[PDB]
């Protein structure tokens, strides 16, 4: 019955299938694990996606963001990597335990990046940035396409992100194509927030943060992520449209209804254009599979309607439902509702405290209850998330900054010239 079909240990021998050394489009291979189709986990500190961030030593204290935490020794031992892999897998299972998280994970699995990398109009070809090189026992390399990579954080440990390799001219995260998403995330740390009671000494369920990054990845796999240039400026530091949409709840209403309808119109037209490119496709390059096979795969991804002549079109109501699922249903607020946990009430609650956790032992954190274990002292009043009642599960590493205690007035920033 579980999401992950295998029980993985970091020291298990590689086989070139689901446990193997790999290489990213941009090093020497790193040991990674294929926990599910199209999803891989690299129990390593991310020094590969950005070589400019291949230094784990903390920058000068003036250059440090107020909400940051550094530890160059984290995720360096085989035991640390084993525990990281097990915790990431457990959080994936906890997300899968809910219907919302299962739906999101299904969307991610079937959200294969589009084969729009050919210079010929009628040819379907894969984009190499959406692949990884898997070492074979033979010793050769296999170019395998995928959807999601979960890698440990870089220098800043609590800097969780979802970023993708880009096309030189195309914006794959915004033209409906999609690209393989790499998520900097760690299950060994959690955040504490301060929400007024209607005394806020509660910690974040890391499943909620992983689901946040998974919603980012789901937006970006279907190529509907909001441009990171569309940003609110806060005054009394900025907040992107993407983050506010991703949190959902009341924060999503910072985006005007007219902008939401413009997004819907543009992505309806882009899905129509993708369906038409599938209709006009005649050749396919670089795969055992047939052209109709890739056609059907992307039909199942974008939920295109197929007439009795094989040609594709987008059912308007099915597009509306898919888009509303990806943007309004996949939200942090809905994940808080499903997990029945306590969490920040707005993405604008910038102040965080940094705590160390160990979610792998089932006496500490379970798939169905998180920290609020059944039939325990932790089951009531979210006591499992109380960093003082459940003190055996949280160890304070960084205190609250105290620098974000003011009303957040958001003002849209205008279009700016760029290079």
């Amino acid at each position, epitope marked *: 019955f579980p999401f992950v079909n295998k029980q993985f240990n970091y020291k298990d021998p590689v086989n070139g299938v689901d446990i193997a050394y790999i290489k990213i489009p941009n090093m020497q291979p790193v040991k990674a694990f294929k926990i599910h189709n199209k999803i891989w986990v690299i129990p390593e500190r991310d020094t590969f996606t950005n070589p400019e961030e291949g230094d784990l030593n903390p920058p000068p204290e003036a250059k440090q963001v107020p909400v940051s935490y550094y530890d160059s020794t984290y995720l360096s031992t085989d035991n640390e990597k084993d525990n990281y892999l097990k915790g990431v897998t457990k959080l994936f299972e906890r997300i899968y335990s809910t219907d919302l998280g299962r739906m999101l994970l299904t969307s991610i699995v079937r959200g294969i990046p589009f084969w729009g990398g050919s210079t010929i109009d009628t040819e379907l070809k894969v984009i190499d940035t959406n692949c990884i090189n898997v070492i074979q026992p033979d010793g050769s390399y296999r170019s395998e396409e995928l959807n999601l990579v979960i890698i440990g954080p870089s220098a800043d440990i609590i800097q969780f992100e979802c970023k993708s390799f880009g096309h030189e001219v195309l914006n794959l995260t915004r033209n409906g194509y999609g690209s393989t998403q790499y998520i900097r995330f760690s299950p060994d740390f959690t955040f504490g927030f*301060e*929400e*007024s*009671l*209607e005394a*806020g000494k509660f910690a974040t369920d890391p499943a909620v943060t992983l689901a946040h990054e998974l919603i980012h990845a789901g937006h970006r796999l279907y190529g509907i992520a909001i441009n990171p240039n569309r940003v609110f400026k806060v005054n*009394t530091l900025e907040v992107s449209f993407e983050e506010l949409r991703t949190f959902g709840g*009341h*924060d999503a*209403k*910072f985006i005007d209804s007219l902008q939401e309808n413009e997004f819907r119109l543009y992505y309806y037209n882009k899905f129509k254009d993708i369906a038409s490119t599938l209709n006009k496709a005649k050749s396919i390059v670089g795969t055992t599979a047939s052209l109709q096979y890739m056609k059907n795969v992307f039909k199942e991804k974008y939920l295109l309607s197929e007439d009795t002549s094989g040609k594709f079109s987008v059912d308007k109501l099915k597009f509306d439902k898919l888009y509303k699922m990806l943007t309004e249903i996949y939200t942090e607020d809905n994940f808080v509702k499903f997990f029945k946990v306590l969490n920040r*009430k*707005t993405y*604008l609650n910038f102040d965080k405290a940094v705590f160390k956790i160990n979610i792998v032992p089932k006496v500490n954190y379970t798939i169905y209850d998180g920290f609020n274990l059944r039939n325990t002292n932790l089951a009531a009043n979210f006591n499992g998330q109380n960093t003082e009642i459940n003190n055996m599960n949280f160890t304070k590493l960084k205190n609250f900054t105290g620098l974000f*205690e*003011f*009303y*957040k*007035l*958001l003002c849209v920033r205008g279009i700016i010239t760029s290079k």
Partner: nanobody, 110 residues
Framework: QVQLVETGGALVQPGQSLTLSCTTS????????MAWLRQAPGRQRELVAS???????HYHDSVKGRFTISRESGKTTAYLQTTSVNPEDTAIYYC?????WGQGTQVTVS
């Protein structure tokens, strides 16, 4: 659909003291906080009062001292009290909580 309604706007003599009230339907004050912003026809939008969901308050330098903003924890209505009002407070006062706005009360001095 959330909505903020503010009341208490009328004529005020410079000696008199005013109280503006703002209420909401879903209690978003405990999520974001609340802000009072006043706009004079000649000037631009001015942030007169702000307060977070925890209670910390911040004021503009024009109204610092003579103004006080209250939210009072679990309550779903916020108040802005003013003493020794002067001509600078002739403006339309709008209520804000995150993305939601009121539609203003007019305050005019003699």
């Amino acid at each position: 659909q959330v909505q903020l309604v503010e009341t208490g706007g009328a004529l005020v003599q410079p000696g008199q003291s005013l109280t503006l009230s703002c209420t909401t339907s879903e209690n978003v004050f405990g999520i974001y906080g609340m802000a009072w912003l006043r706009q004079a026809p000649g000037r631009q939008r001015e942030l007169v009062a702000s307060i977070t969901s925890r209670g910390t308050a911040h004021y503009h330098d024009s109204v610092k001292g003579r103004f006080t903003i209250s939210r009072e924890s679990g309550k779903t209505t916020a108040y802005l009290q003013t003493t020794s009002v002067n001509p600078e407070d002739t403006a339309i006062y709008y209520c804000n909580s995150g993305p939601y706005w009121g539609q203003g009360t007019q305050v005019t001095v003699s």
